[PDB]
Design a protein around this ligand. Structure first.
Ligand code: FUM
Ligand code: MG
Lengths: 362, 364
């Protein structure tokens, strides 16, 4: 039987086509750690995860140490077929650092798929190859935001993720401008990234209802830990409420289900620590009648591919996967065609379908 | 008006005299990161935090990067007196990594006290200089466990923290041996490190009550996130239930208070990310009528001194501060008198008094 006999890691930095600015940070590149697992039959698997320290607490340096010194001793010499057990044993030695776990989990799935000579998407049960993404619009003044949205529509996106929560007055006034400039064929997804309080959230919802807008979701309006407010907003709202930072893992999902704190969960592999835990969330959500979407960090097209593979296998059609729009096409053109707004997996790939040759070998 | 003009770090590795084993992990050593903040008047201040990856997720490598590349740009050039808003802005850039935050928070407190020519304990409002600690006992077979406790008793410890949760059958059998070997002048504290399930915890508490033992606390019997079981256990138990891993920060404290999920919170600076957040927890607990104790990771004496200084200032008298007993005396004797089981702060130290630059080479 196949055993994992080697583990390597590599830091990969990808340039962005434009400056990416968040509440805490500004950057021109993506930081990623890649891991390579080698079987004793020569087959190599790969996984790639972002270090988004502000969200998951991961750092490249921490991930590298965790994988080399903590996970590796558990993994080396183990049978591939025992992966579920090996991963449970390995991950229980580390609190948090979900992105480090993601990299390992993905590499394992790459191995499992390659051993069957299929794609990871196929391994996971996917049939369809294509998923629609929104385009993500950064915070800004009303004028430039309206323009950014217009560029998105002209680029063929009909689903628009509008970031809010930085300036509440701006968020409210934006609604008037949206109602004037756009019809109901454009659908909006707001993500406040924890920036609103309870009263503000209610106001924003009421304000939406004063206009005629197609608004699909209100995402993470309040602090990740204020589950009471999330439940109250979910009850108050006529628009589906999405838990993002409130849900990393299956036990977080259990809490928001128990407390009725959202209508939909935004699953991100960098939060879940990869595909196994993401599957557990989807299963819990299905049982509870809670819908799921998929999302990502500003991260490698490799992570996007893994996420799209998971969503296609899980019948998740709502996706915020835009980072492909931020990087050079030739980075992903071997495994993905992005014909906006469609992310389309290429045919006949083995495993995920990307290799690290340039980073690891050249 | 003093301004922070440099930030440097050094790794510290310390060997343990004996093996530390809990339900979560086993180790013979402590890995820590020390940070040094330099003021423009030349005064330096220090903090030290453990990398206990299985508990706080911190690593030496992540801590180094966070402190030098993430926190440092926010801190460098800032006025010392701006510490509260500087730490708030810096800490917002990093989710988790509470031990990295502890190191920086402690270094700031060292500076604050030094600038007033007093000890940190004095800065925080302490009156007393002495706190009593238990000694903790590694998971192991019954015979070796009894021997370790006997060692502790002969060393003058009367409060004994017994690690459980690794082997439940052993845990139950041990109670019989304790009852046979020790009087009620010995006070036991059980800590399962999350290792039991709900049914086991109830059975253990029932078993305790079949014997004659002086049992002070049952600590974190179940998973950190099973707040429902913690509440059920708290309501079932005649013994105070302590939340440890269930409470890192003030918002965790609010949750366990709201859900009646413990009788007491074990405050650790490596979980809170330092003194400022630990003070917020204590205040919430006081308002809720919930008691606090202080605890630690298996960590350097520098973290122990910082924690004792906080406890003394907050009128916290219940302490699991034992790592001094696991390491060479000469590591702490500059700043602490440990007349077991009493941790006594030395007189007339400025700031904490760690004296780290003497033994460590700090680099930016
Ligand atoms: O593993 C440690 O460092 C400490 C654990 C505890 O005392 O709870
Ligand atoms: Mg979001």
């Amino acid at each position: 039987v196949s055993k994992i006999i080697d583990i390597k890691t590599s830091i990969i930095k990808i340039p962005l086509k434009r400056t990416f600015i968040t509440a805490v940070r500004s950057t021109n590149h993506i930081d990623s750690l890649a891991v390579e697992l080698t079987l004793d039959n020569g087959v190599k698997g790969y996984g790639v995860a972002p270090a988004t320290t502000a969200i998951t607490g991961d750092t490249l340096q921490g991930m590298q140490y965790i994988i080399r010194e903590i996970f590796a001793p558990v993994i080396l010499g183990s049978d591939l077929s025992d992966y579920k057990q090996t991963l449970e044993l390995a991950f229980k030695k580390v609190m948090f650092n979900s992105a480090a776990k993601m990299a390992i989990d993905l590499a394992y799935h790459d191995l499992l798929a390659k051993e069957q000579d299929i794609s990871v998407a196929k391994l996971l049960g996917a049939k369809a190859n294509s998923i629609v993404t929104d385009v993500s619009i950064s915070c800004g003044n009303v004028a430039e935001t309206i323009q950014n949205i217009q560029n998105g529509v002209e680029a063929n996106f009909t689903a628009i993720k509008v970031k809010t929560g930085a300036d509440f007055n701006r968020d409210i006034q934006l609604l008037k401008a949206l109602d004037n400039e756009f019809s109901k064929n454009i659908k909006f997804r707001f993500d406040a990234n924890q920036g609103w309080n309870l009263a503000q959230t209610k106001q924003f919802i009421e304000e939406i209802n004063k206009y005629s807008l197609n608004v699909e979701i209100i995402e993470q309006p309040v602090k990740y830990y204020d589950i009471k407010a999330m439940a109250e907003i979910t009850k108050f709202s006529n628009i589906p409420v999405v838990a993002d930072e409130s849900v990393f893992d299956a036990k977080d999902a259990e809490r928001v289900i128990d407390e009725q704190a959202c209508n939909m969960i935004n699953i991100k592999l960098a939060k879940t620590g990869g595909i196994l835990e993401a599957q557990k969330i989807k299963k819990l959500a299905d049982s509870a009648g809670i819908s799921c979407m998929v999302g990502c960090m500003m991260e490698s097209p490799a992570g996007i591919l893994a996420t799209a593979s998971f969503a296609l296998a899980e019948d998740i059609t709502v996706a915020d996967l835009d980072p492909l729009d931020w990087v050079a096409k030739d980075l992903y053109s071997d495994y993905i065609t992005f014909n906006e707004p469609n992310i389309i997996l290429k045919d006949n790939l083995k495993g995920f379908g990307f290799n690290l040759a340039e980073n690891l070998y050249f």
